[PDB]
Amino acid sequence: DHISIVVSASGESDERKMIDNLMTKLKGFAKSTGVVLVVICHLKNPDKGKAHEEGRPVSITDLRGSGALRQL
Amino acid sequence: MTYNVWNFGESNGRYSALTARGISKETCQKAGYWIAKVDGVMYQVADYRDQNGNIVSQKVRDKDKNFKTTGSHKSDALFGKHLWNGGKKIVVTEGEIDMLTVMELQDCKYPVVSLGHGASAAKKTCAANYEYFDQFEQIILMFDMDEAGRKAVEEAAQVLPAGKVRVAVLPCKDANECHLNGHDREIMEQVWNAGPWIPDGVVSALSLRERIREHLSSEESVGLLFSGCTGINDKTLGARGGEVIMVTSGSGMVMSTFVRQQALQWGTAMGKKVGLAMLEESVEETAEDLIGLHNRVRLRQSDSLKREIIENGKFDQWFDELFGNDTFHLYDSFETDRLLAKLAYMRSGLGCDVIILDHISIVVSASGESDERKMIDNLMTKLKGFAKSTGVVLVVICHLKNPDKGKAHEEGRPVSITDLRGSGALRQLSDTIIALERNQQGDMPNLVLVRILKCRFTGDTGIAGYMEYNKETGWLEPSSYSG
Amino acid sequence: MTYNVWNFGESNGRYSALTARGISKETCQKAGYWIAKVDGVMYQVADYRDQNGNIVSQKVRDKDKNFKTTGSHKSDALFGKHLWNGGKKIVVTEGEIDMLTVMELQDCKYPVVSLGHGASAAKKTCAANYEYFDQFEQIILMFDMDEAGRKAVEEAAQVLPAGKVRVAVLPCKDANECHLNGHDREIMEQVWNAGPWIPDGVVSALSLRERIREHLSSEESVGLLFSGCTGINDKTLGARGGEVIMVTSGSGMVMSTFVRQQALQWGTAMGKKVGLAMLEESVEETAEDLIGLHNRVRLRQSDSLKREIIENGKFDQWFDELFGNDTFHLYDSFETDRLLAKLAYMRSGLGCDVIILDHISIVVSASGESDERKMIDNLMTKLKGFAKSTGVVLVVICHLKNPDKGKAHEEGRPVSITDLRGSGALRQLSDTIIALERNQQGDMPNLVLVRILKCRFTGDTGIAGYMEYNKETGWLEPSSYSG
């Protein structure tokens, strides 16, 4: 519950990048060991008109990260 | 060059039984524990060989509890190692004698090796041997049953392969103390089927029953009630420990009063110890603002009264009155990491249950870094961590960016979470968001509105009530009002 | 191998009383301070055992001040540690002898341990033992009363658990120097009830009484009243020393008058010595502007009058009249550091209590550096420093960037702190912000508004009154005005 929290090893830039690094280790863990890994993850916030509580549907573009999750 | 490996025979070697330890003669013979005697005195020699069979080093003993190490004792030395290459299960003991022990009890038929530098070098010796150990299905750490011995296990398993390590648990200091009249059978029950671990943070649910029960009674639904506007309470059900309350609003000093007020009633009405990091102002200043607020008088804001109470003794009186219950404590200033640390000791050391952090906008000290946009978030988290990790109540004040859209902040303009500063961390990490609006050029220039902008614990949000500034006493009084 | 642990008896051991230190024989016996004698010479042996009881290491002494350390002296060694597992309070002394001391004075009934490598390894030895020490309610650091000894305390408490640490304060170097004829009762008054600390910036409120009461008398309420608009005063309560008042506004010469006016009444009505750094103009010019202003006549702005008062003696008269109280002093020009230095000597040397610095916008001299955005801030701070550090009142004039949004400055357009120049330093470091607006093409082209844009000391802000320009006398007159 809730990938957005990375946490501990501080001297490093974009959560953009790091989110991805963890993402893979996870998918590895997953496939490597056959466990089912549900991973919760929260949404960045539009800038476009209708918010989240206004229902606005979400796409994979609508996705957070920078591709790892949108993939892995 | 290095100390020559001791030749058997050259030094008057015998494979004799260690009668003092209940290790048989036949046993010492198989692991390579021989008894030499050079230049007069009789030494105990342990032969360390590599997986290939040769002897690469020796650990020699004399009676009195000395040593002498021959050959080249590499960082990966395991005594016994050469005997086993593969298997379903390998016990790994602290020292050579304990290896000799398990090797008995088992009629030397299964694998045991001992740590090369054992004790302290558990981590290094082990990781040096990942491959060797992975040759076996499960690795049973049978180390010392003491302070540094449990530690050894810990550091060991950390570097050892996957789900294979299991901790041995004996009745006595070591596996030999057991054998030496006691409980052979106890050692046995562990070699077959030891506990399985190092989970130092994994915690099955079953094993929480008690911790839960005592939680349920201890911590409270109606945590700490906001004061000056039932409403704040009605909607948020209070400031529960480990939460992160976030007070925000426009120009609001209204804001800095509201927090102050809460600080006040929590540290007096309620029993709670408040800790204050009012980064804006001095520590003396805030204390005055408290005292005056407590006595419903605008204390700093008045030459005359200051003088008056200094002289008429009322100061020392009021001061005792409010403070003399060691319940208020302030961070006094002139980094991010540096601050957080201070705040923590407030929580941990003086054990206050609220920490009010006035005005997150001030990051401060470690300068070579870009957007306060980003950094505001970084701190945000350390904070929420501090919070949940320690169950302290963390109120955090925070000021608003300024529209660009038509009506300003003193024009009342309501605030949304979009209206929010930061770039997401607060807009997220905060548990309750209380905002206060004040149209200081209007119908009630002293009327201030309270939006609950968010409240995890309830999710009941919205307009929550009104207060009115008493320019005279300095308080945010509660007010009548609605549609 | 490592130096074998010294066997009692093997070395001719006796538990004898240390007559040189006032440690009884019975005492040395309990902590494990025994007196051996090997190969001829008589050594003092300290027995370090782990919590389990077993002797893990020895620290041996000979007469002349040497050592010899037996066994394995781990980074967590505490001499006496094995004696206590829990308790309400544990004294922790620098060395073994001092442990023996507290162990006396108390008839060995309470806990004392000594640092394993004491002196310098205070941080390491301590944090190695967090758990062990947390077994007790309060940890009393009774270290050396010297340079490195106070430091030891500091590094120690840093790594030690929460709000448990309290520093011992003895009359002499150590707890034994006390015992050795002096003040046993001094050591006692510390073991019980010794004062707590080790937070270097956290400060319980209770512990501020005094600092507060001297504050309240010392610092002051109605400091120096703005002239020409009670309002400015009403809202700001004046220009208190060490503050940094910041006057701003559009094209405002209005601004440069307002400041001038203030300078005027402060240095004449009030006793105060004004120092002026009018960077825009010459020193002679500003002096004329003052004289004229004081005599309600537009002096420089008039060929005829100049001549007139030069001849009719009125100049020399007016000049004496205004100036001859050595109360005005000006920085006269043709760097940032260089300026700040001059300003300081005004404060420190001639001891003026107000410095008016007309027009921050002018940084000047040290050219190889980017944004005035950034640099404006750098100066800003040195200034606020200067201010608070020396208690001088620093008024600082500052001009406004120009909108890009519709109505200009001479179109009256109000100003906000966003509306602010700089990039945050002034928007911050300044204590009161007075702004003056003037819609010089309108209904009252001579009417000027005063916003208080900010005021730490009171936080009462906003529209604060009006004045009117007398194009004729040159003054900012106070005016009737509202809704």
Side-chain angles (χ1 to χ4, degrees), chain A, chain B residues 2-158 160-483, chain C residues 2-158 160-483:
Chain A
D1 198 312
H2 183 14
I3 204 270
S4 319
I5 306 91
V6 282
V7 138
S8 246
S10 326
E12 28 77 86
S13 311
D14 244 287
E15 270 241 31
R16 236 191 291 179
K17 173 271 110 204
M18 209 290 118
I19 181 245
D20 285 26
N21 186 308
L22 156 55
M23 225 5 204
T24 68
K25 316 221 181 114
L26 283 205
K27 188 35 205 295
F29 182 40
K31 240 87 177 314
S32 107
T33 79
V35 61
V36 183
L37 201 82
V38 206
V39 158
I40 269 276
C41 154
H42 289 186
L43 296 197
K44 14 112 113 214
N45 258 240
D47 262 77
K48 203 19 209 154
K50 90 156 148 302
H52 271 87
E53 23 298 316
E54 218 148 33
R56 169 217 256 251
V58 356
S59 46
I60 322 56
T61 131
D62 238 43
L63 231 245
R64 234 202 208 177
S66 270
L69 348 65
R70 350 224 264 212
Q71 215 159 269
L72 279 39
Chain B
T2 114
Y3 274 110
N4 285 352
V5 238
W6 269 24
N7 281 150
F8 189 117
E10 263 220 88
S11 34
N12 310 141
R14 311 160 341 161
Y15 278 132
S16 83
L18 312 162
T19 52
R21 308 281 223 146
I23 302 289
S24 51
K25 163 158 156 301
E26 212 219 58
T27 277
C28 285
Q29 228 253 224
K30 327 217 171 155
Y33 205 61
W34 63 289
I35 309 89
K37 28 224 110 213
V38 189
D39 284 83
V41 149
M42 151 187 351
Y43 306 56
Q44 229 150 313
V45 212
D47 267 352
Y48 288 73
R49 359 195 124 205
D50 50 8
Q51 300 200 262
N52 224 254
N54 297 16
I55 309 201
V56 210
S57 52
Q58 243 123 321
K59 257 206 17 179
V60 195
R61 94 71 116 132
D62 81 349
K63 53 247 175 282
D64 335 77
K65 261 185 268 282
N66 246 354
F67 287 77
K68 273 124 151 239
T69 156
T70 101
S72 296
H73 213 42
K74 273 239 152 178
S75 311
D76 82 314
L78 267 216
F79 165 70
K81 156 199 228 147
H82 66 105
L83 309 175
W84 344 96
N85 248 84
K88 254 213 179 98
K89 199 200 302 224
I90 187 211
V91 176
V92 156
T93 74
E94 175 142 339
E96 293 111 294
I97 290 267
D98 278 291
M99 189 279 241
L100 289 244
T101 300
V102 158
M103 279 244 2
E104 262 267 64
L105 308 189
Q106 295 197 279
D107 198 41
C108 308
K109 291 175 58 191
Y110 300 94
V112 234
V113 302
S114 123
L115 288 188
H117 317 250
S120 15
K123 192 123 104 284
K124 218 220 233 185
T125 254
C126 259
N129 274 322
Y130 196 82
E131 353 59 20
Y132 169 80
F133 281 133
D134 202 22
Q135 272 195 299
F136 308 96
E137 227 148 320
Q138 89 189 206
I139 300 163
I140 309 215
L141 299 216
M142 210 187 247
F143 297 4
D144 270 18
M145 280 324 232
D146 56 61
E147 241 164 353
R150 249 63 294 250
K151 229 246 168 70
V153 177
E154 276 296 284
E155 236 79 351
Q158 225 96 4
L160 269 148
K164 303 182 114 134
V165 242
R166 19 258 328 291
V167 140
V169 151
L170 298 141
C172 338
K173 187 223 199 60
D174 42 67
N176 183 269
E177 173 154 318
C178 297
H179 189 37
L180 285 216
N181 287 183
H183 340 285
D184 271 296
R185 161 243 281 68
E186 257 68 289
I187 299 175
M188 226 72 299
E189 294 174 6
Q190 309 282 324
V191 160
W192 337 315
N193 53 277
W197 83 121
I198 355 115
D200 199 317
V202 111
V203 187
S204 71
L206 256 341
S207 53
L208 288 109
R209 146 137 37 207
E210 284 313 320
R211 187 161 18 149
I212 290 174
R213 152 122 42 52
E214 118 75 59
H215 180 100
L216 275 154
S217 326
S218 256
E219 239 32 72
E220 138 249 65
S221 19
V222 229
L224 237 79
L225 300 93
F226 285 110
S227 246
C229 187
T230 48
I232 333 295
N233 280 144
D234 278 351
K235 275 222 193 283
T236 83
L237 232 297
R240 277 156 296 283
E243 304 206 304
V244 145
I245 318 281
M246 163 138 314
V247 194
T248 197
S249 102
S251 215
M253 126 258 154
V254 212
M255 199 204 307
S256 220
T257 293
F258 180 83
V259 173
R260 219 131 292 195
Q261 225 148 132
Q262 245 74 28
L264 226 217
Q265 117 108 13
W266 287 343
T268 49
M270 324 304 258
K272 318 269 157 309
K273 245 179 225 112
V274 178
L276 304 175
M278 246 42 62
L279 304 207
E280 267 304 27
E281 69 210 25
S282 88
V283 65
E284 15 270 23
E285 274 176 22
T286 109
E288 310 184 11
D289 276 312
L290 276 190
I291 286 167
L293 198 36
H294 187 235
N295 282 79
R296 325 297 151 122
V297 310
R298 320 264 291 101
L299 181 40
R300 7 220 308 284
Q301 294 95 0
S302 159
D303 178 15
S304 71
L305 205 227
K306 264 126 113 246
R307 139 257 238 147
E308 238 250 305
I309 86 179
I310 295 277
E311 300 188 299
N312 73 357
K314 293 205 116 243
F315 165 82
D316 284 284
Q317 183 187 161
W318 281 359
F319 175 106
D320 285 341
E321 248 300 338
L322 157 70
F323 282 138
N325 251 222
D326 206 38
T327 160
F328 299 89
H329 314 254
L330 322 99
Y331 168 122
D332 133 37
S333 199
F334 193 165
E335 187 163 29
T336 170
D337 284 327
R338 160 204 275 78
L339 175 83
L340 237 327
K342 305 305 227 147
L343 269 121
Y345 162 95
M346 305 207 3
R347 174 33 135 157
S348 270
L350 347 106
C352 6
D353 10 46
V354 179
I355 295 285
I356 293 185
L357 180 53
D358 193 309
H359 186 351
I360 202 271
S361 319
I362 306 94
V363 282
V364 138
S365 247
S367 326
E369 27 77 86
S370 308
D371 243 288
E372 271 237 31
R373 236 193 288 180
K374 172 271 110 204
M375 208 290 117
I376 180 244
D377 286 28
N378 185 311
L379 157 52
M380 224 5 203
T381 69
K382 314 225 179 113
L383 284 207
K384 190 39 207 293
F386 181 43
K388 240 89 179 304
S389 110
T390 84
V392 64
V393 180
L394 207 86
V395 209
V396 157
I397 273 268
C398 150
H399 288 186
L400 294 198
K401 14 111 117 209
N402 260 239
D404 262 74
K405 205 19 208 153
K407 86 152 149 305
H409 271 86
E410 28 295 319
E411 219 149 38
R413 172 222 251 253
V415 355
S416 47
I417 323 58
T418 130
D419 238 46
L420 229 245
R421 236 201 207 175
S423 267
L426 349 66
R427 349 224 267 215
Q428 215 159 265
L429 281 37
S430 321
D431 305 340
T432 309
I433 279 3
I434 307 157
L436 335 81
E437 338 208 311
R438 163 209 236 264
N439 160 232
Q440 343 152 213
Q441 37 122 32
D443 287 327
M444 307 82 105
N446 285 322
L447 183 62
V448 22
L449 183 130
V450 218
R451 254 152 237 300
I452 282 310
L453 253 54
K454 127 129 167 218
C455 184
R456 240 222 266 109
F457 191 70
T458 94
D460 184 33
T461 65
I463 282 320
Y466 298 54
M467 346 204 238
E468 156 131 22
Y469 194 55
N470 196 153
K471 297 210 194 160
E472 222 253 304
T473 79
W475 277 72
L476 243 9
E477 261 129 51
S479 189
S480 46
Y481 219 99
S482 239
Chain C
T2 117
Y3 271 109
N4 61 2
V5 239
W6 269 26
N7 283 154
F8 191 124
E10 276 226 51
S11 35
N12 309 144
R14 316 155 341 160
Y15 280 134
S16 85
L18 317 159
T19 55
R21 307 284 222 152
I23 303 290
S24 48
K25 164 159 159 297
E26 212 216 58
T27 273
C28 290
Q29 229 257 222
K30 326 221 169 158
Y33 204 59
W34 62 288
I35 307 88
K37 28 225 115 208
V38 190
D39 284 85
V41 148
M42 150 194 342
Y43 302 60
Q44 232 152 313
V45 213
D47 269 353
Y48 287 76
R49 3 190 124 205
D50 53 9
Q51 303 199 263
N52 222 256
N54 346 271
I55 311 203
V56 211
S57 49
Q58 247 122 317
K59 257 209 18 182
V60 198
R61 94 73 121 131
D62 79 348
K63 52 244 177 286
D64 335 81
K65 272 178 248 277
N66 247 352
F67 286 78
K68 270 126 153 235
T69 160
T70 102
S72 294
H73 212 43
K74 275 233 154 179
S75 311
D76 82 311
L78 269 217
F79 166 69
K81 159 195 224 150
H82 69 100
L83 311 176
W84 344 97
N85 251 80
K88 250 215 180 97
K89 201 198 299 226
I90 187 208
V91 178
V92 158
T93 75
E94 175 146 334
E96 293 113 295
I97 290 266
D98 280 291
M99 187 275 237
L100 286 243
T101 301
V102 162
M103 274 241 30
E104 263 267 66
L105 308 189
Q106 295 196 279
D107 199 42
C108 309
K109 290 176 58 188
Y110 300 93
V112 234
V113 306
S114 117
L115 291 187
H117 319 252
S120 13
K123 196 123 101 283
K124 219 221 232 186
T125 256
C126 254
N129 273 323
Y130 195 80
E131 351 63 19
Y132 171 82
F133 281 138
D134 200 27
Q135 274 195 296
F136 311 90
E137 232 149 320
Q138 86 194 206
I139 300 161
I140 312 215
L141 297 221
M142 204 190 250
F143 294 5
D144 268 19
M145 284 323 239
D146 54 61
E147 242 164 349
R150 247 67 294 250
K151 227 247 171 68
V153 178
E154 275 298 283
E155 237 84 345
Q158 227 92 7
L160 270 144
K164 302 186 112 129
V165 240
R166 20 254 332 288
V167 142
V169 153
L170 297 141
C172 339
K173 194 217 193 73
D174 42 66
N176 184 270
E177 174 154 327
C178 300
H179 189 39
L180 280 219
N181 281 184
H183 341 284
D184 271 296
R185 162 246 278 73
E186 260 68 290
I187 305 170
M188 231 79 302
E189 293 177 8
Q190 307 286 323
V191 159
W192 342 309
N193 68 257
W197 23 78
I198 320 137
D200 202 311
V202 111
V203 189
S204 78
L206 252 347
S207 65
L208 289 103
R209 148 135 35 208
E210 283 317 318
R211 187 159 17 141
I212 293 173
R213 224 155 73 329
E214 119 77 57
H215 177 107
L216 273 154
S217 326
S218 253
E219 234 33 65
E220 138 248 74
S221 10
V222 224
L224 241 77
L225 301 93
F226 284 111
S227 243
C229 178
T230 48
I232 335 298
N233 276 146
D234 282 350
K235 275 222 194 278
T236 85
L237 234 293
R240 286 156 292 281
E243 302 207 303
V244 142
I245 313 281
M246 159 140 318
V247 196
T248 195
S249 84
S251 204
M253 128 263 154
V254 219
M255 198 207 304
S256 223
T257 298
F258 177 78
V259 175
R260 222 133 291 194
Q261 219 150 134
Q262 247 68 30
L264 222 218
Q265 117 107 12
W266 291 345
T268 48
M270 326 304 257
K272 313 272 155 306
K273 242 179 222 113
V274 179
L276 303 175
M278 253 39 94
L279 305 208
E280 264 303 23
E281 74 212 12
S282 92
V283 58
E284 13 270 11
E285 281 175 22
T286 106
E288 314 180 10
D289 277 314
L290 275 189
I291 288 170
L293 196 29
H294 182 234
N295 284 86
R296 325 297 157 117
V297 316
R298 321 264 286 102
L299 185 39
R300 3 219 309 284
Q301 293 88 7
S302 157
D303 169 27
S304 66
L305 206 224
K306 265 122 117 245
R307 138 261 235 149
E308 235 250 306
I309 85 181
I310 293 284
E311 303 184 300
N312 76 359
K314 293 207 115 239
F315 164 78
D316 282 281
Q317 181 183 162
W318 281 358
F319 177 107
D320 284 341
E321 251 295 343
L322 163 64
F323 278 140
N325 249 225
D326 205 36
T327 159
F328 297 91
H329 313 258
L330 324 99
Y331 168 118
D332 126 38
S333 196
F334 194 166
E335 190 183 3
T336 169
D337 284 328
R338 161 202 278 78
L339 174 81
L340 236 326
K342 307 302 232 149
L343 268 123
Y345 161 93
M346 311 202 6
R347 179 31 136 152
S348 279
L350 346 107
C352 13
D353 9 40
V354 173
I355 293 286
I356 293 185
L357 172 53
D358 194 315
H359 197 2
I360 204 266
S361 318
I362 304 95
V363 282
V364 137
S365 247
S367 326
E369 28 76 87
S370 308
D371 245 290
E372 271 239 31
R373 235 192 290 180
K374 172 270 111 205
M375 208 279 151
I376 180 245
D377 287 26
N378 185 309
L379 156 56
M380 222 8 202
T381 70
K382 313 224 187 111
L383 285 207
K384 190 34 205 299
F386 182 44
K388 237 86 175 312
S389 114
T390 81
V392 64
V393 184
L394 208 84
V395 214
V396 159
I397 272 271
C398 160
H399 289 183
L400 294 201
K401 13 114 117 209
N402 260 236
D404 262 72
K405 203 19 207 154
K407 86 152 149 300
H409 271 87
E410 25 295 314
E411 220 148 34
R413 172 220 251 255
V415 354
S416 49
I417 323 59
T418 131
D419 235 44
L420 227 248
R421 239 201 203 176
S423 268
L426 346 62
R427 346 225 267 214
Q428 216 157 264
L429 283 38
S430 323
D431 305 334
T432 306
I433 279 2
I434 305 158
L436 332 81
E437 336 210 312
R438 161 208 238 269
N439 160 230
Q440 341 154 211
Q441 36 121 33
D443 286 327
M444 303 85 99
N446 285 319
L447 181 57
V448 20
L449 183 132
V450 213
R451 254 153 238 298
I452 285 309
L453 251 54
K454 126 135 166 218
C455 184
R456 237 221 269 107
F457 191 68
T458 97
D460 183 34
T461 69
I463 283 321
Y466 296 55
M467 339 203 242
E468 157 135 17
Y469 194 52
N470 193 156
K471 297 208 197 154
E472 220 255 298
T473 77
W475 277 69
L476 240 14
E477 260 130 53
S479 191
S480 48
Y481 209 103
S482 252

